[PDB]
Design a binder for this molecule. Sequence first.
Ligand SMILES: OC[C@H]1O[C@@H](O[C@H]2[C@H](O)[C@@H](O)[C@H](O)O[C@@H]2CO)[C@H](O)[C@@H](O)[C@H]1O
Lengths: 152, 165
Amino acid sequence: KENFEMNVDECGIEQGIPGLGYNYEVLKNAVIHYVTKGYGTFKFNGKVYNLKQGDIFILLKGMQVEYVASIDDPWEYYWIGFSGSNANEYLNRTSITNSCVANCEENSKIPQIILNMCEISKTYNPSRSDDILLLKELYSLLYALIEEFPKP
Amino acid sequence: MQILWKKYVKENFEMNVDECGIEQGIPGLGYNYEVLKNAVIHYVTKGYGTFKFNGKVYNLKQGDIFILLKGMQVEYVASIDDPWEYYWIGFSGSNANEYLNRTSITNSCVANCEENSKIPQIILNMCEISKTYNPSRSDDILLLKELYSLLYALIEEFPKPFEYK
Ligand SMILES: OC[C@H]1O[C@@H](O[C@H]2[C@H](O)[C@@H](O)[C@H](O)O[C@@H]2CO)[C@H](O)[C@@H](O)[C@H]1O
């Protein structure tokens, strides 16, 4: 119901409103975002990233962040909030938590896993074991982040 | 008779891969004991053997699964003529034991995999990963992913009526 080792906290899909975003200190453990369409800007630690389709950004507890949809073509993004002792150990095996921004390559497994987790969560039915399927997918996602963004 | 027997640490309390192995049976030889481990699923890949539990006898062949649960008094023995080969996954955890309550397989502890079953590929993949187990390449994440896949496939292919509480 709430797992300690590996937990899918929340899944969502946001359509940005032109020029609108968020500016706050992250409370949640970890939230990975995948940009499916349009444009927005992520600002962290004095750096600015103009993101587009194929881009990922990750929020971690304690980060002071600003992210805003572009005026002209405001982004759509899929997001997975997750927690757990296993999850935080696996996040330390990827380089993505250095800048907290990355570009998915053409043959990336990451987009299909994030889209599949958000699809499952739309009709979430634990009596049909959708809970097993979301945890399966979270383990797949963390493996794919490590494989595609290794710590060298 | 063990081609493979990889024992893992009880690292996790929610879901843990305890061990993976491959046994080629010796004609007429087997085991007779009270299960100590949480749960062990066996998939028969070739040949024939017999599983005996609670006064029932099952002659198993390729495609068959049998599951051992803590406290079961069991005997399983390779046939004389064409002794079985079987792959096995030992696993534990609070999530694992909750998911086992959603499948009908724990009634007789024996089942037959259908033609289009996902179970054989997952078990064979987990035993293959265990052969060159490398946690620095995150083989630990891969085995847990596969164990979640395995428990999902058991529930999908051997459903029990279940209302989530
Ligand atoms: O665990 C599956 C594995 O069991 C072996 O038998 C062992 C068992 O693992 C152990 O807990 C118990 O104490 O003794 C048994 C041997 O008597 C089987 O040898 C192997 O083929 C698998 O089925």
